[PDB]
């Protein structure tokens, strides 16, 4: 039964990548949710649409890369539903912005477990997979989004319509 | 009398893009009017007059090609006086976009009764030509409409004229 | 009331503005019609349809023209009713040619009226203006309307069909 | 023996494609006798026979892109004889061209009955391919075949010969 | 509540397009789990995987165009949880085309209903946008799963695996 | 009734050219039905419709040839029914290449008939004509299909099926 490439690949390092992969397909979902929501006439913001769509973007392509890595070391994918969306209204932008950032939040403390479940079972190979291609991205975009909130505040009230206006159109723009 | 290329074109179809024809006109018409009316020296908004401009240019273009339409089937056109616009003063440029949404809305509901007339009559030549060359642009034009205003109301009061330079500058500019 | 920028301008000078532009606008329209019914399969003259739609086109432009220098000098444009052309039919290619060149005479008629206005009031600008863009246009398209009826003449009878061929495919063409 | 990718194609547009199939094949067939009339040394007229050859070629594309359409939905081809063309001795230009419209109206009358058998059975893939692919260009080719009679006609008698001569040097050629 | 440029919208043509919408991102996701099935090392197919791929990907815009129409007509996006595939072993490649085969056509059933249900409200721009961008698609990809199948059943046994792997480097490599 | 270009030109072979341009149709028929046959999806070999579309068409420009030949030498053409080809099902790749063997067999034959009667009546121009033209290309042909049939003979059982995509990928691919 296990594959004639298996070596060093434990049950628990297993299960980790499936569960991490469902994670980020929910996170893809909810991020075009969070896009098409910006599409609206009633919003009518592009560029947050935009940016949460490549946010989109980006997770599926983790999510498939999570996936290479599993077939290559005689792992065996396991598929499961996909959650809807929290939320089907997202409010203001300023409260979008702080949902994209309490996912990104959660999906690094996922990463950080399977880090050191990995780290557990004297497992190289996973333990530079993950810091190569996850860990420092997403510090990148936390502090990112960080960064887009704290300004989003700064401009704010009293004016808020022509404060996210203004950030739209030069920030994101 | 009837012309030796007509086959399967009713006298109702044929009446039906002769009115069309004129309020394609008028469109024209109320455009011009909305555009120059921007290009005062009291109201001097360049970027309105422009996009206005534009409709007017788009509105003529369509009006040609409902002619050669109703030349190319071998129906005979009829031309009838163009009434002026309703206004001479357009008032803000928020009442001005809110005048386009309505009279865009107007042409798109005559051209789907016109695409319903066609379909009584059984003329798949017709109804192919609406689909294809008016309603998905008129869908498109009436949803960008819906963005600048909603746009234009978030900015708005209190500073209402700051908020129209920055709309003029920004999106439209 | 009186624009900040309005000087030397009089009340005479901008109704008879007014009043240039509508008839700019109605030419435009007699234009139009008159292309299009050379457009037509019992007709099937396309240069014909060709030439007066670039008139068309030209007196549009000059009517746009009239309304830039109506907004320059700080009067305010009156739109209003655009009535249709005389007639349905144009008949041959030697009756439209006629009632094109009565249009353009009509029209020169007019500006030169306007002219004697303007200097009647010391506003050396609407002259200049007159002068520059609209007076040596208007004779040299008398002029050259004159030349085509010339050669139509010419040619024409006994073999009246021939000859409008020949001359659409040659001169026109 | 219903093929596998058959979904919503019924027995009587697989009929009317194959009957239809045929008609292009024969109108095809009476194009090219026509041109290869037109080549004759006691005819002459060069540019007749290029432009009925190509409606030959046009012809028979149509016919190959019917039998692609058949050959995509699950449908099978059944190929039938081709009459020949009624004619051995096709006349004056005048004559020729007054056949070819008279065939190219009895293509558009077989095409829109396949358009209303076609709305008549639920299928909108086959009506949206007639509309994409046929009505459109039956049409302007009916409208260019009556311009070119007109002119015929206005040119004509007195000097027949003349006038078909300058035709075809002019116009065609 | 009713979006400004609502015009000729009915609630079952949201409601269908809502369920087309997760209809698609089904597919999307069934086809991403047979690629990466024959990604797997026992397998080792690449071609199959790249072709399965592909699939994913062109589902997965079909569904992003599924909601910017809904968004372009004033209709609201609900979004609802992903079921996941039916298999996590996809067998053979004869099996996998197979299935792929059948989700195809149950997705143009679905396009087929909607289109039905769209004619019943009497809403040209739907039909139009179904017949444009959806339904001869689907039956070039039908189309282009059954001739697949049949080379594979044409080769097929004895040699099983040879033929298979024939196929993978010739046909989709 | 003679032509005034006629000079040593006998009915005979005006009658033999006859029958050979309408054999040289039907020929073009029966390769048209054989590609559309192989088009099919429940047979789906690509590279055999494309051999076969490619032999029609040659097939049809020969016929044109033929055709101008006759128009030159002051002949008068006269054109016959086609009839259709003798299969509506051309069984496996292996018989449509035996039949079309046979066909390109049968035309070479007419053409060696139709060389023997211009020797009878000493017309070395139409002698020269079917030398350059049309016998070494009958030969080549005849020759290829020669050459195609027997290594799809080679290949064929016990595996036939892989023998036909191996032929169909390798050979004509």
């Known amino acids: 039964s296990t594959s004639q490439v298996r070596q ?35 919003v009518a913001l592009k560029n947050f649409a935009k940016y949460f769509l490549h946010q989109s973007h980006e997770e599926r392509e983790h999510a498939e890369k999570l996936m290479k890595l599993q077939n290559q070391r005689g792992g065996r994918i396991f598929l499961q539903d996909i959650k809807k969306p929290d939320c089907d209204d997202w409010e203001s932008g300023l409260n979008a912005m702080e949902c994209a950032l309490h996912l990104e939040k959660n999906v690094n403390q996922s990463l950080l477990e399977l880090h050191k479940l990995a780290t557990d079972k004297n497992d190289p190979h996973l333990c530079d997979f993950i810091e190569t291609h996850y860990l420092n991205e997403q510090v990148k975009a ?23 206006y203004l950030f739209d159109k030069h920030t994101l723009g």
């Open 8 to 42: 060093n690949y434990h049950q628990d390092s297993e299960a980790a990548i499936n569960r991490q992969i469902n994670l980020e397909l929910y996170a893809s979902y909810v991020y075009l949710s969070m896009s098409y929501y910006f599409d609206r006439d009633d």
């Open 142 to 164: 936390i502090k990112e989004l960080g960064d887009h909130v704290t300004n989003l505040r700064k401009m704010g009230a009293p004016e808020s319509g022509l404060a996210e």
